[PDB]
Amino acid sequence: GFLDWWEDLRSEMQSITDSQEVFAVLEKEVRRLGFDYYAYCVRHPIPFTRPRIFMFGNYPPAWQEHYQAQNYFAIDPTIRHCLRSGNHIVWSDDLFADAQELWDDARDYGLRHGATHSCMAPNGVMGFLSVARSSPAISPHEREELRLRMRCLIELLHQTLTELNHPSLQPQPICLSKREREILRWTADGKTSAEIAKILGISESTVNFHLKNIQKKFNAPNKTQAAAYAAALGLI
Amino acid sequence: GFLDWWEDLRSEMQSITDSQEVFAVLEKEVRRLGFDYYAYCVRHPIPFTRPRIFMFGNYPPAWQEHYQAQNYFAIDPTIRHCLRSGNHIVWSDDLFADAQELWDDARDYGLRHGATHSCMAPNGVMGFLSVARSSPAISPHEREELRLRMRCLIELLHQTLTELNHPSLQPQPICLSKREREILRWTADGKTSAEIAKILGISESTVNFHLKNIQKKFNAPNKTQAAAYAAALGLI
Ligand SMILES: CCCC(=O)N[C@H]1CCOC1=O
Ligand SMILES: CCCC(=O)N[C@H]1CCOC1=O
């Protein structure tokens, strides 16, 4: 049953070594879930004026290209950072009130019923897993069973991709030293370099050296971007 | 069998009356898991040098005091908002490799074996769940079973306390204005006030004027903490 399903699925993911094998095993499971297509979206908090949004899925090619040209990823409630009750939500006609053009188009493309579960990794990463179909309708008895299985899929997706180091789940890799990480904390808490020189006992001259070295790693012109990026990525 | 227990625990948890009854039924579930002690911890992202931590659990009161007096909550490996190895950490005799002074105190109070699971909410708040015992060791086949039963609990604990609107799960109410948001995003993305004056049709004195009122809400002395604090709270 459930224990059997999760056991075999953990085996397949721990066995592969390519990104394509991940997205082939998922498409198989989603077909077994009773849905026609799926879609996995990973978005990062940085940059704040242009959050990177990545798209992976098997939606009909005519729709994947429509969803990109029509800029639907900017008015889509499914991919929204807002808090969702239980991180799970089923596609409702009223869910797309401020996006009636997106929902209307999706229905004539064979995407009438589906759900979306949103995980959240501690490094700013927030994943969205969507499953869609057209003929069936989410039966209530299936509602609760669907949430549990999809939380399994997106939790094992996150696990395998980050274990395989796929660039979508790796937002701006930056190595921080034990001394460099603790300097950036007190700067992020608003204390000046002259004050951090005593907290750590490393002198003001040497404190500024590490900060500038951190600015170089962040592509940061100043120390305010280095602190904001580090705070959003949970690196601090 | 599993899907049955989840729906049962899900329905019994729907009784939103008091938080005391919530922590009680969680206690009975840990007992059903075969463990003697538990401890739930709510973690807010700021301040970065001393995160606001709310402590709930049935750990020995003298241990929760010694665990707090010595400030182990900052150097303990059981909690870690980073390198989430499957988001599960079956306490290993090697996990406490260095700085394992609290590993002696823990086993003296009767906590020989256990595990800890963590979860992240879109609003930056992060929860930690642990179960402890001292009589047996953790078998690998029940360990794979532990990953699901525990992830379901901390996922249903955040879900419940968010439905009850428990005050510990609420970050500081430091909301920004519309223009105050557009300006904080740019300042956090590294660029100076003089260039934001060019991006918008606004003067440099007016750009730096909002930066003063933004940090007044955060009670921050400089602009670096303001951007860093807003980013952690997901406000930018
Ligand atoms: C998570 C990817 C976005 C997504 O699923 N959008 C939905 C809106 C209607 O048709 C779709 O495909
Ligand atoms: C993860 C929360 C803290 C925790 O459960 N740590 C345990 C390990 C042994 O002594 C403790 O206090």
Residue numbers in the entry:
A (entry chain B), B (entry chain A): 6 to 241
What does the study report here?
The majority of traits controlled by rhl transcription factor RhlR depend on PqsE, a dispensable thioesterase in Pseudomonas Quinolone Signal (PQS) biosynthesis that interferes with RhlR through an enigmatic mechanism likely involving direct interaction of both proteins. Here we show that PqsE and RhlR form a 2:2 protein complex that, together with RhlR agonist N-butanoyl-L-homoserine lactone (C4-HSL), solubilizes RhlR and thereby renders the otherwise insoluble transcription factor active. PqsE is a thioesterase that triggers transcription of the RhlR regulon through a hitherto cryptic mechanism, which we identify here as involving a significant chaperone-like component that enhances the stability of RhlR via protein complex formation. In common with many other gram-negative bacteria, two QS circuits use N-acyl-L-homoserine lactones (HSLs) as autoinducers, namely N-(3-oxododecanoyl)-L-HSL (3-oxo-C12-HSL) and N-butanoyl-L-HSL (C4-HSL), which are produced by autoinducer synthases LasI and RhlI and activate the LuxR-type transcription factors LasR and RhlR, respectively.
Indeed, the PROSS-designed RhlR-P75, in which 75 (out of 241) residues were mutated with respect to the original sequence, could easily be produced in E. coli, even in the absence of C4-HSL or mBTL. It crystallized readily in the presence of C4-HSL or mBTL, but not without these ligands. A complex with C4-HSL was less well resolved (3.5 Å resolution), but the shape of the electron density confirms similar interactions. Co-expression of RhlR-P75 and His6-tagged PqsE revealed that the interaction between both proteins has been lost by the introduced mutations.
